[PDB]
Amino acid sequence: DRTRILAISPHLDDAVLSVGASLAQAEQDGGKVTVFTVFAGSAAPPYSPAAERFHARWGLSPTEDAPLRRRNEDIAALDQLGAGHRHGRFLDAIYRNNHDLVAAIREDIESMIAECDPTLVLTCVAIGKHPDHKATRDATLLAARERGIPLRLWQDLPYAAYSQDLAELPDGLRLGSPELSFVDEEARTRKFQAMKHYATQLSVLDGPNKNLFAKLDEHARNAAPDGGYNETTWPVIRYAAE
């Protein structure tokens, strides 16, 4: 039920990159979309050399507020998909045990669910094994289950176009069968246009010779050679509870 979709993105870019066309298609179909990003917290200059290195790679200068730049990128992108944005308080791995973080994230996701009253929640399956993706996913599974909201896990992009598939779920959980969500040409066009806004991240992901848009078209194509642009998600089955 796509009437009210709440997508939980680990970082500023992940939702658009992975489910952007399905989100666009939901909005075109008359549904309501909100993307909440967990790791969208504030940090102004001055930064650590380790952060300066990541910033320099995004094309940012020492005095520029990076998380602000990225929050602005996220707003521009989501606006093009007709999706609402909500920015979470957590700091990217790069400006900073596991249980305390998951529990903190879960509380905020519960607060977001109560506020947005969604009929469907989405988050990443955490292909690529980023610890922020694992934390976001795990917290979202707990929060959506507590609030009895249906949930799907998406195939992280572009990461899935290069490698893996097998994600390591919490105990007692496994993935249901994968489902391809097909979209029309305008939803795909809107996705790719929205992706251009995350210029900071695309300076790596669509760096010289990265095939990003081609790679994404090819990936979608591999999954359904005859039937246009598509994105993969899975339902979650709980075979065992504590």
Ligand SMILES: [Zn+2]
């Ligand atoms: Zn990410």
